[PDB]
Amino acid sequence: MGVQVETISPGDGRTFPKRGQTCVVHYTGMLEDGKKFDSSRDRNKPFKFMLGKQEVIRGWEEGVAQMSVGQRAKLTISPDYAYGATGHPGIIPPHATLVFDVELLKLE
Fold it and tell me: Which positions bear N6-succinyllysine?
């Protein structure tokens, strides 16, 4: 599987990220058992990335592109769209399905 997008709160339903735009998000990343491994909210600073530059995992590139500005959504990402067989030693185990809570604050 790739990435599944499940809404949490609606956005404007009209403005979706296009290639080359900078997405400003707050996010929380959890393992499939619910353990949080990363969160911009615990740092109290939104996370910015440019769509299409592969600065984020493939599940983020294709999942966040489906969100409208203002939307909060749950992204469930299989390992192929994620850290794969190798994972990230000590943070993300092998073959890990990840769950992200993502809020698209604005586009820059």
Answer: 53
